[PDB]
From a paper:
Structural studies of the homotetrameric bacterial sodium channel NaVAb showed that these four homologous domains come together to form a functional channel with an ion-conducting pore at its center. To overcome these limitations, we introduced these IEM mutations into NaVAb, a bacterial ancestor of mammalian NaV channels, confirmed their functional effects in negatively shifting the voltage dependence of channel activation, and determined their structures at high resolution by X-ray crystallography. All of these structures have their VSs in the activated state, as determined by the outward position of the gating charges in the S4 segment, while the PM is closed at the activation gate formed by the intracellular ends of the S6 segments.
The structure of NaVAb/I119T at 2.75-Å resolution clearly indicates that the side chain of I119T forms a hydrogen bond with Ser132 on S5 of a neighboring subunit (referred to as Ser132′). Despite the conformational change in the activation gate, the pore structure of the mutant remains closed, with Ile217 forming a constriction site that seals the activation gate of the pore, similar to the WT structure.
Residue numbers in the entry:
A (entry chain A), B (entry chain A), C (entry chain A), D (entry chain A): 997 to 1090, 1095 to 1220
The structure:
Amino acid sequence: RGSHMYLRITNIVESSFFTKFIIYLIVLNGITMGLETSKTFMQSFGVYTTLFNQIVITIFTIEIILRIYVHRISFFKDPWSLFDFFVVAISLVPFEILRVLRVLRLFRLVTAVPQMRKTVSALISVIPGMLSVIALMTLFFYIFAIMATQLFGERFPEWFGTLGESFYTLFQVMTLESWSMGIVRPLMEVYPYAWVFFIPFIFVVTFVMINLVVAIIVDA
Amino acid sequence: RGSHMYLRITNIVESSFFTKFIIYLIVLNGITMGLETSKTFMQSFGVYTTLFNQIVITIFTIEIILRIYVHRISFFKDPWSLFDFFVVAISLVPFEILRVLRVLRLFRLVTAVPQMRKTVSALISVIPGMLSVIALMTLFFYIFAIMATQLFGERFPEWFGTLGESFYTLFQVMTLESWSMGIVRPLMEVYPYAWVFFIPFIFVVTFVMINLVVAIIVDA
Amino acid sequence: RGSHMYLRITNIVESSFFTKFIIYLIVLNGITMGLETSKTFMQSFGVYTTLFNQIVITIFTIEIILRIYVHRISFFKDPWSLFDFFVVAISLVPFEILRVLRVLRLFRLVTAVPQMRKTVSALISVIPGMLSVIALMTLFFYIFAIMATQLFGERFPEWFGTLGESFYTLFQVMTLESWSMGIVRPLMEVYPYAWVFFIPFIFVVTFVMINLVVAIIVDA
Amino acid sequence: RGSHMYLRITNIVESSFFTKFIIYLIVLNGITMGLETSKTFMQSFGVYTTLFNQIVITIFTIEIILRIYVHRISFFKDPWSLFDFFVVAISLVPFEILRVLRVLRLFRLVTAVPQMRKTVSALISVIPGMLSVIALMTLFFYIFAIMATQLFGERFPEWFGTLGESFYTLFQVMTLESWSMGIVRPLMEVYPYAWVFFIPFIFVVTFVMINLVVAIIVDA
Ligand SMILES: CCCCCCCCCCCCCC(=O)OC[C@H](COP(=O)(O)OCC[N+](C)(C)C)OC(=O)CCCCCCCCCCCCC
Ligand SMILES: CCCCCCCCCCCCCC(=O)OC[C@H](COP(=O)(O)OCC[N+](C)(C)C)OC(=O)CCCCCCCCCCCCC
Ligand SMILES: CCCCCCCCCCCCCC(=O)OC[C@H](COP(=O)(O)OCC[N+](C)(C)C)OC(=O)CCCCCCCCCCCCC
Ligand SMILES: CCCCCCCCCCCCCC(=O)OC[C@H](COP(=O)(O)OCC[N+](C)(C)C)OC(=O)CCCCCCCCCCCCC
């Protein structure tokens, strides 16, 4: 708990060399994961690189293990460690989507470098003051998604045949991407007043967005 | 007016249980209205759900009735109640567009939950300081819509054949959606100087938009 | 100069009735110009409406004449009058583009209604603090327009064959409209490194835009 | 170092006539470079204009030479001169991409006119406070670019077959250009859950952008 061998390990994990080594590895596994992208490189130096990968996964597990010895329950209430935990855990399951999620370990460069932690933490910090407006927005989407599903799903199954599909399309209308040439004008060929649904939608959603952003600037 | 039975009802509508019950119903009729979206679910449990729907419509009418007993003319000068009124009234007419408008009762979650009321009320509050710029903008749209109708409606009836059609297209140009690839470049094949109409339009409309948004930030 | 008949006319133009009458006409000629949009209406009540139009043009010329008697050289240093002048002058030439420009007289509702004048004047007021950045931007466009004309005009004459054409396309890239799917990806089929031209362009132009807008907010 | 002939040259380069002459040339070589765009003009007055071009290149080399005599090592620590240096150097190599880069000398109008220098310098000044967020963003792009390359490169080689290609597409998704109609909806025909990759991408990238812009406004 504060004994002979505890304090030995503690002085290692807390050493700058520990951090730097880990950061050094992250930038290295980073570059390695970008070259693994090339089947040319993969064909030649490929096995070299599978090697470096479990090496790094092992080093990271050892590290995480140590960090829990040194920190115990303090470790499992730290966001930055919990991230490092789950990211490294993912990289330990041997469903290809998990093989790809391995790349999430590169986000450890964020947890590791305090300049980054501080940046991310600044960004995350404005989200709580947004929840109420975001709650309002989601209700809005949900309601309009229902309305659109049953107004247009039958003739327009791809875009609106399903509550989820309508959610997708409504998000696309919010981003303004092809909303008129690709969605609303087609609808109007069948539903001449469809414009009464999407223009108010676009007005509300955009007004909310601007205010949401004025919200952020309301602290500064 | 302040009698024996009046004060009895008053203590019920004003009870927290009343509010919570109503909110409870709203979240329930909400989920129900999302499952009604699926013809699978509709095929199986469908009648169960038509049931829950008039049940809720009845409960809501009773509630609204009570709330007017307790509030009388104060009720009909409250936005939040007037909304609840009109929304529930809609849900009472038996034109499919009214069947769909029933979903508007889910917005009662806004009127009911004071955190939401406050949010919405914040948003709505900035609109009056915008009316003058919005008035200016609409005049602008109207004038340019007339000009475009008669400059391009004859060769381009779909986009500009009608004052309303031109309004629609001009709105789409304002959102910047396909303005060049899908509208102005086609026009230029017939009207080489059409760019003299839409670039200034896009300049004015965008300048106004930014200032409109600086307007909001002019209080904060 | 300040005589018997001068002061008589002066009391008329300066009367509220004068202003209101003019405003009344503007809203009327406004509605009339929107109905002239319909060949149906035009077919039936059409001549009624050509009538109301020169009537109003005459009334407006008389008014402008009076206003110069009452104001003399003060009139020709007022923006709002100079506008009214040029707009009404246009409406007096009998080239269809002038027939359409007649609709610009509806902007007299702006000059006439002081709430509008004040709004417009607020908007116009931020433009001088932008000129320097706008000068920078235009130079930027000019230079990149030259570069693009000679990098891509030969294989891509429609988009870049001409300094003006390149100006048009570059403006479209700035608005982000189809910049990749419709312009840059096509170019890359011939010029694989074209992305080195348009991504920096899009970066600079967007950075400038944001700062231009922060500029406005730098007073507030 | 501060001798007879040194101080003679010094009084010339530091003269207002020197600056004005140079500026005069820049506006002239500017106009000339825009007319060189027309093969009509090129066909007729073309050689006149190749002439004016080396004339100006020579004058500029002489100038730069002088300015280094007058300034020595102070010259090579000035951004504005270093620019003028490299821009003029480019214009001295006789690979067509260098023939086009000659047009970069028009940016000397920026270095020369102090109102511009000040503007540019204002703009550049906000960039250092952005580096941390920009670092975060680039890491984000890199990681998602890797993930997309291996999730979609095989079936969608054009958009994602290569780390660079995925970088390009991800940038396009960030600008929101055709992200749904032209990229994600096509992907979903093969990968129904692709929406789980690009919506969070679009959320993060947009949130960061707004905060990056609130950053700028955080000084004002
Ligand atoms: C005030 C009220 C608050 C209510 C909050 C809770 C809402 C809960 C959502 C309800 C669940 C709806 C699920 C559902 O019906 O799924 C539909 C479809 C699959 O149905 P399926 O039977 O396969 O459709 C057949 C297709 N057809 C018609 C073309 C032949 O599959 C999908 O589309 C999947 C569903 C995706 C959408 C989920 C949206 C969650 C929104 C949360 C809003 C929170 C507001 C605060
Ligand atoms: C300073 C002046 C202020 C004036 C303010 C008041 C303006 C009032 C609007 C005038 C009414 C115009 C109605 C009208 O002409 O409707 C046209 C069309 C249907 O005409 P129709 O005869 O069916 O066209 C035949 C089609 N064709 C030529 C291709 C064979 O149907 C439509 O397009 C319907 C009309 C939709 C547009 C309504 C716009 C309202 C703008 C309000 C601006 C307020 C400014 C403060
Ligand atoms: C520091 C330097 C400052 C210099 C400022 C002054 C610049 C003055 C602009 C120079 C004039 C260029 C005019 C010109 O060459 O016009 C080209 C074309 C028509 O040429 P054309 O001979 O018909 O082309 C034949 C077509 N082809 C090759 C496909 C067979 O026709 C057009 O494209 C018309 C020209 C439109 C563009 C005008 C742009 C003005 C930019 C102002 C920038 C101010 C910066 C502060
Ligand atoms: C925390 C970790 C930090 C790591 C930072 C350092 C990252 C260094 C990047 C790694 C280098 C990757 C180069 C590479 O693999 O190039 C791939 C391709 C050409 O490969 P190739 O063998 O031709 O592909 C064959 C094509 N196929 C499969 C369809 C038959 O060619 C390309 O696509 C060229 C590569 C372009 C992308 C360069 C991106 C630099 C991102 C910098 C991020 C900084 C973060 C702070």
